[PDB]
Amino acid sequence: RYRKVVILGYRCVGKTSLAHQFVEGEFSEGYDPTVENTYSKIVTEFHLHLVDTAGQDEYSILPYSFIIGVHGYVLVYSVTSLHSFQVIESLYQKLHERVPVVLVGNKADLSPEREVQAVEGKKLAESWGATFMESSARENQLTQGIFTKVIQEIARV
Ligand SMILES: Nc1nc2c(ncn2[C@@H]2O[C@H](COP(=O)(O)OP(=O)(O)NP(=O)(O)O)[C@@H](O)[C@H]2O)c(=O)[nH]1
Ligand SMILES: [Mg+2]
C-alpha cells in the first residue's frame, strides 16, 4: 500500500532529523536547510513516502504538492520554541484553507529549555481532531511512534 505523508513546520524544529531518525536510525548534530527531501520506508505492508519540506513561516504560501495526493500530515513544532508552536497553527489554518494529522512537539529531550507544555499542544490538536504527541529525534523510540501512528491513523480513516 503506497502512502504519501508530508512533514510541515517552522524551520529548525527537527523535521529532517525526525525523518532521518525514523528511516536511517541516526541523528546528526549538524544543520542543513531543506529544500525538499523524500524518505521512503516500508512500514509493516505500507510503502511510506515521507515528503520532508522546507521550513515555513506565517507568511508562506503552501504549494499544491503539499495538498494533492497527500494521505496524511505530520506537523512539527519544537517544545523549546513557542514561536514555532504559533507558526504551526498558521500552517494548519493554511492547510484547512480532511486528512489524518499528527501534531508533534519535538526536542522534548531539551527539558530545561521547554517553552510549550504538553497540555497546550494536546489541546490544540484536540481542537483540530488531530492526534498529539511529543518526540525527540535523538531517540529512536520516540521518533518511530510518530510515523507508525500516522500510518495506523491513515489505515483507520
Ligand atoms: N536536542 C535535539 N536537537 C534536535 C532535535 N531535532 C532536531 N534537532 C537539531 O536541531 C537542528 C534543526 O534540525 P532540522 O532537522 O534541520 O530541522 P528542520 O525542521 O529540518 N529545518 P529546516 O526547516 O531548515 O529544514 C539540527 O541542528 C538538529 O541537530 C531534537 O529532537 N532534539
Ligand atoms: Mg529540514
Task: State how beta strands 72-78 and 131-134 pair.
Answer: unpaired
PDB experimental method = X-ray
Beta-bridged to residue 2, according to DSSP, are 47
Region for residue 129 given its phi and psi (left: phi exceeds 0; alpha: psi -120 to 50; beta: otherwise): left
Q: Is 36 in the pocket of ligand 1 (CB under 6 A)?
A: no
Among the bound ligands, name the one nearest to the CA of residue 15.
Answer: 1
Classify domain 1-157 by CATH architecture. Answer: 3-Layer(aba) Sandwich (3.40)
Report the amino acid identity of residue 97: E
46-68 as b/e, with b when 16 or more CB fall inside 10 Å?
Answer: bebbbbbbebbeeebeeeeebee
Report whether 134 contacts 106 (CB < 8 A): yes
Rounded distance from Cα 43 to ligand 2 centre (Å): 22
Biggest alpha carbon–alpha carbon distance for the chain: 41
Rounded distance between C-alpha atoms, residue 38 and residue 79, angstroms? 25
Distances in Å between the alpha carbon of 131 and those of 42, 57, 122? 22, 22, 8
Resolution of this model in Å is 2.3
What are the boundaries of each domain within the chain? 1-157
Cα 120 to ligand 2 centre (Å): 24
**How many Å lie between the centroid of ligand 2 and the Cα of residue 15?**
5
Q: Residue 151 corresponds to which cell in the numbers above?
A: 500510518
